[PDB]
Amino acid sequence: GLFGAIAGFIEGGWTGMIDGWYGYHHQNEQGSGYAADQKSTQNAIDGITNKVNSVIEKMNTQFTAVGKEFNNLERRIENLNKKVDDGFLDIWTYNAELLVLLENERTLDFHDSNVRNLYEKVKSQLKNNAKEIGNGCFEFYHKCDDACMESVRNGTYDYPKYSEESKLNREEIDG
Amino acid sequence: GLFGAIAGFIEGGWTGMIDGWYGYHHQNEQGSGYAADQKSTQNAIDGITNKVNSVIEKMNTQFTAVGKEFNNLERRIENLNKKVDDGFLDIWTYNAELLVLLENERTLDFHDSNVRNLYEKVKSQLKNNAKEIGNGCFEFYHKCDDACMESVRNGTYDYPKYSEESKLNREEIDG
Amino acid sequence: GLFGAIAGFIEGGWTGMIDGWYGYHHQNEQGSGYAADQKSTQNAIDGITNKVNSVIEKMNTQFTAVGKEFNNLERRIENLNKKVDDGFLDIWTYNAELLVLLENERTLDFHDSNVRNLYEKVKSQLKNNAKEIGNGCFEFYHKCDDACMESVRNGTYDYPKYSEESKLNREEIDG
Amino acid sequence: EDTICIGYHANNSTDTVDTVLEKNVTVTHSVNLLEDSHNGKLCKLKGIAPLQLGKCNIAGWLLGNPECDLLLTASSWSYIVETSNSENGTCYPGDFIDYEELREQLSSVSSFEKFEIFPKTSSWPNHETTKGVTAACSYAGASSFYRNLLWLTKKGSSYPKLSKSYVNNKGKEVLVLWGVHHPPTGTDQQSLYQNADAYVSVGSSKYNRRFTPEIAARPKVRDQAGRMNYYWTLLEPGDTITFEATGNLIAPWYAFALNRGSGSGIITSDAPVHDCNTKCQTPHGAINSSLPFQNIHPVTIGECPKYVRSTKLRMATGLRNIPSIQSR
Amino acid sequence: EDTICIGYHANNSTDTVDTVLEKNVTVTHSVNLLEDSHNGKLCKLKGIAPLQLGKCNIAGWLLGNPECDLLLTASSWSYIVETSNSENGTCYPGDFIDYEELREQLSSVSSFEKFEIFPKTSSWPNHETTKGVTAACSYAGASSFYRNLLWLTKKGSSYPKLSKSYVNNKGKEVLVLWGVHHPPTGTDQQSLYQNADAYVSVGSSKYNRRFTPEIAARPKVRDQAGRMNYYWTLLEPGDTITFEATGNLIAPWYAFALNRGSGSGIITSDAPVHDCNTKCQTPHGAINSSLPFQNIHPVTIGECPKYVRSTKLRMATGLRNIPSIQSR
Amino acid sequence: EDTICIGYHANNSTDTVDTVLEKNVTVTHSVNLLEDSHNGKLCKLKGIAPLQLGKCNIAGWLLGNPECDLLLTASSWSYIVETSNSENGTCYPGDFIDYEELREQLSSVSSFEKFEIFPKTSSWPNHETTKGVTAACSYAGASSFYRNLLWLTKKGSSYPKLSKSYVNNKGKEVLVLWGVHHPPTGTDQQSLYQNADAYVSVGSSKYNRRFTPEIAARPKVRDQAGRMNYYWTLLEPGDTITFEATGNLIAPWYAFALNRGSGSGIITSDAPVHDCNTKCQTPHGAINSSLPFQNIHPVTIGECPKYVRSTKLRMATGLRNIPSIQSR
């Protein structure tokens, strides 16, 4: 109810890591369109790769290390040696597991937030000149052609240009 | 200022884990009502119990293990043995502590976000047909009876049905 | 596009930890103003200090501990002893690193959220009586003098007081 | 003017938790992640009870210390419990070799069985078995000796080289214990073994070791200037151990047969042993092990939660009772 | 009515991950953090191959056990591999002192070199070198002995005190091994060494130690009631070791010279050694070590990922295929 | 048109930190979580200074090595510092038994006190104390010996069995050290002790042990083919230690009395010891321990921060100076 899945047919679309993109889907006289937003999608791809790399790179501490052998009168050291092994095993297993689970709810929220943040960014440009109609769509109060659509998708929509036309249509369309 | 505590009297209300619920509080001709939102509250209950379980289940690694005894010429092993015990003690205590603290600011934000997300969802349906008046309330521009209220609380509010009535009232109420 | 950097000239401004503040920047007949929001900024300072303290205090576990010496027939213990040292080294390094990196994306989101939350709080008071014009600014539909401005900054703006004036201006300014 | 608010309801609660940003938040519900109490009893691990040595420790019980005779034994155990009053061990002054190792290896046993490896009545016709007791180990007011070992002495101005060997036709390992005596002077050597230059040799297929009397002057302990070292060894199923000596053998009388367990340990607790079960045993008491952390004792036996030095670890799951600054 | 929707597109995917709040979410992409497979071969660490003892273990190889003679050796190794069929070690019954320590110190060696420390032909004119073999160590059907050691015996009703010493002019450490024999009876003592009250003394500038025959009766092992202990020691570059005895010396014949490595270890694997490289070697096989975790085996050698008992660890990076309840 | 913007103001800053999503973000403030520097001095732990052995190591100081005589001692220490020039220890070739254990147990002592356990002047009227020095341990150009021990020799073609014993009426433990000499030949045995078949027996109520001369040929060390082993033992408050020998006893002259501490250790540092305090001491220098992590040295003593191999760990707390893409 806040934003939908841009019903892209299922293209090869974009770059790995995120296997998709944040974008638009318009409808004007000229026809319909699907466009992915570069500036936002790309930032996320950089972010999430930076994230995956940290999780991997920052380990890369290990050094040549091993495992040991004792005799029938060294049962105590042997078990001290196991306590160590298993101690580590429990620690990593627990952290690596929690870390992935926690950090996954994060990546997924991150995506949802970026999509919503994009909506707020378009809302910021249009203002008055459009009507919020749910499901992350704006209905324009002026004729918005492909050129005008493009200026929205790349953050250069000129509000004042259409304010007056929009004023008329809105005064006597909604209210 | 964004949403309040639905002043429910203090019922036995809902299911454990979350000891409460996300919901509504209306006022129409018929009278006033308090209704918890099933779909949203429930999702959170499932999520938080999934969360608590991970934190507990994923440990369940431990295996039969112990503690050790040495003699007056084995002081060094003994102390090596302590270094291990205490090492582990520091590690778990720091992680279990941080982990609860961090993950508690999370659970609490999670709740606040679901409530605000519910608000955005209702805002999505009503649109024009209502007025945002602060503190997470909508004032209707049309007569909304118990049936119409129910359709809001369960995501089926029919906008076009009240658009025109709302239009009139809004044109000459606000504006 | 949702909120900007209050172009404060670069004052000694506020208290450490956060080396800045959440605030406003107005413009009315009387002139322009920059005012930081006490209630919100302060809350964050308390939060983030509480956060930095937890990360430090909760460690404070260590106890008198050390490192060890063995002979030419004790190579195996010696290496068991290194396995322990390095084991620990890898564990803390990885966690301390991840912990700072993860918890740094958090602190930064926390700031951005508080600034946006403040905007939604002002939106909550003004409602109708002002117009959202992007970049985290409201345009008033009535004359808002320094006294009226202060009431906004401190959560006491009286909506009904300016509703009617605002009604007129808005009906025949926008729409 | 029909009106609808969206918000959240919170039930009554006193539950408080902590977060990174606040110190004492009242939420409507929390789950404790910390195990922080114990039933106060030594229960059974692996559905088996621990070996409960009474007024005496592993050494006294393994050797047959007299005070120890007042005590029972079962055919298996999960772990071993010594109390703060198990002072009765090696009553005749001396050193138990690899005492720590033996104690470790006996912590979990499967099918204990004590048996007469070298019966007193028939094993030593040429040596004296009748005499050979000491005040150091006294029972019922009189001078006595270990129940599980036998102190051979010259039958009459002669101690002919002896050589006896067990063969271990049991189906499990045998634990054989013996001892070597060190008289405090060469006169005693004579009185006891009549063989100034004597020795003790003990040989399994995996265990060769010679012994000689370290004849020397030393402080009295339980009124004894003499010392004796107690040694042990695990005999393997087909293998045979063979003793041979001209003096100073505190010969084996009873040996043990058992299957050693995975790897338990020893707990020193004055708590009472009861017939309940536990996944995790601690010295003050048993604990639940469904939670991931625990603050009772670091020294534990079982599949135990991690010892942490925290006081309380409450994970919030509920709603705030005082609404947040964010929500205002 | 010109219209614009903002939302997100997700590519087709079956990739599933877990989060704290949901159990089986389908995302459009994930990165595995877990190393969970191995090439199934013992490769080279530090760009060097492991020492690969064949039908025999380190003792049999270090001493010259006959079966071992069928085997090669290189001048260096990363680690050592014993197979599940390296049963041929110390063929004459006895104890290898500090066997575990030696094994540890030889796991990574730099410039191995075996040399004749005390040539048989010329080192012992007054003793007998010709005779001195045993069924216990037999080669090609006949009674034999270790290839690296030499069993000195009375030349004819006499074993004069011998005293020989090596000086170590090599530029590295020398590992010198010898043995002391323990006849099962005094008759054998005479037959072999003709010197009832004999001894063996071995002295480096860092190593004094006396030995004596523990003459005793014992069970047969590979048909031998006699035992021998095998000792060793590392001789330092300028230092000299000196042997001296009146019986019972299984004298050194060949010694070793080498530079001991940082600190490897020993792997027991029946996998085949191949000429590939690895940062991380496991007993079942080598593994990639670019990822931070691994679930193949805890016992590893190299710069290895952390052994974790997880089955899968997928880090989501993609978009959800089924949009979230939040987004609706 | 009256207007109001809500935003945030950020002060000037160069502070930069890292997050999971960005590599070099300029924030207005951060707190360093890493301790990454040290005052460069060995301070006092537990408000006590370390024992500072000078030109010599623990052995040389415990025994009375001559070079060591140039050195002071106090009645307590937190830890011990050996420098890179503490070469002077056991000046007469030989082995210090359990040297590592003793060094561990003396790392924190409470009330040190050296005392004359067996005064030379009066303790040995039948043996020779006057002579018995060596080039190996020379002071002021002449042949000498350890200040803390005494080398008994035949008074004149005889060394009667000696037997002396201390009783320990001090209130604390006594650390008694002695030595056993191993002549390089039986001729020297005679010259020194006149007793070919001699021995040394030492007995406390918790310590029996015999010693014999391992007479053997060996390489010279500091010009000595002879060796001597130095043993030690802790005598308990009421207990008595008793020595007894017919040769080869480097008898105790001075012993030590002390209360052993919790559990410190030994640091090898060439840094200067100063009169400052520290919760955490490192070999290069002392460090603050209010922060949770540290990258100076892993080998530490005290209540120390965790050694981590990070370079910088800055926790952001401030606002971004370049506003985020989210905020635009």
Ligand SMILES: *[C@@H]1O[C@H](CO)[C@@H](O[C@@H]2O[C@H](CO)[C@@H](O[C@@H]3O[C@H](CO)[C@@H](O)[C@H](O[C@H]4O[C@H](CO)[C@@H](O)[C@H](O)[C@@H]4O)[C@@H]3O)[C@H](O)[C@H]2NC(C)=O)[C@H](O)[C@H]1NC(C)=O
């Ligand atoms: C089994 O262990 C028990 C308990 O550990 C042990 O009982 C003790 O026996 C000895 C006999 O050798 C008793 O004699 C002691 O002598 C010493 C030294 O002179 C003292 O420390 C003791 O004095 C106290 O106890 C006396 C009687 O109880 C009192 O008369 C006196 O006022 C003191 O308070 C004591 O005289 C000793 O009495 C007991 N128990 C103890 C510790 O008091 C037993 O010997 C062991 N037996 C075997 C077979 O191992």
Ligand SMILES: *[C@@H]1O[C@H](CO)[C@@H](O[C@@H]2O[C@H](CO)[C@@H](O[C@@H]3O[C@H](CO)[C@@H](O)[C@H](O)[C@@H]3O)[C@H](O)[C@H]2NC(C)=O)[C@H](O)[C@H]1NC(C)=O
């Ligand atoms: C090298 O190792 C091989 C592999 O173990 C040895 O061969 C085996 O030698 C053993 C030990 O002496 C033999 O034991 C005998 O078993 C037969 C039946 O198997 C039995 O009749 C005898 O009573 C005796 O117990 C065994 O036969 C033999 N097995 C094989 C594989 O042939 C070999 O002895 C080792 N040699 C060296 C030089 O270390």
Ligand SMILES: *[C@@H]1O[C@H](CO)[C@@H](O[C@@H]2O[C@H](CO)[C@@H](O[C@@H]3O[C@H](CO)[C@@H](O)[C@H](O)[C@@H]3O)[C@H](O)[C@H]2NC(C)=O)[C@H](O)[C@H]1NC(C)=O
């Ligand atoms: C106390 O410790 C010091 C420091 O090691 C010792 O001084 C060193 O003594 C050794 C052994 O006598 C010297 O070796 C000799 O070197 C000379 C010339 O440098 C050489 O010609 C001789 O043949 C001999 O090898 C050494 O030089 C000297 N210092 C050095 C440079 O290391 C001292 O001996 C110790 N004394 C005691 C009482 O423990």
Ligand SMILES: *[C@@H]1O[C@H](CO)[C@@H](O)[C@H](O)[C@H]1NC(C)=O
């Ligand atoms: C808030 O500040 C304004 C400015 O003077 C004032 O009207 C009001 O009394 C204050 N009230 C509160 C509760 O802050």
Ligand SMILES: *[C@@H]1O[C@H](CO)[C@@H](O)[C@H](O)[C@H]1NC(C)=O
């Ligand atoms: C401990 O309590 C848990 C949690 O209710 C229970 O499920 C478990 O069976 C108990 N464990 C014991 C003491 O056997």
Ligand SMILES: *[C@H]1O[C@H](CO)[C@@H](O)[C@H](O)[C@H]1NC(C)=O
């Ligand atoms: C939480 O702890 C405080 C101490 O600051 C206590 O006095 C207070 O009652 C608690 N909060 C509540 C209201 O439960």
Ligand SMILES: *[C@H]1O[C@H](CO)[C@@H](O)[C@H](O)[C@H]1NC(C)=O
């Ligand atoms: C998650 O999806 C897979 C198939 O995609 C299935 O195995 C699993 O059980 C699903 N989740 C549930 C239980 O709803």
Ligand SMILES: *[C@H]1O[C@H](CO)[C@@H](O)[C@H](O)[C@H]1NC(C)=O
């Ligand atoms: C901001 O930068 C200027 C540049 O010189 C400096 O003078 C000013 O004092 C800075 N403020 C702070 C907080 O350091």
Ligand SMILES: *[C@H]1O[C@H](CO)[C@@H](O)[C@H](O)[C@H]1NC(C)=O
């Ligand atoms: C990170 O910040 C520093 C200092 O503000 C700057 O010099 C460096 O170029 C930055 N790295 C980039 C470009 O990401």
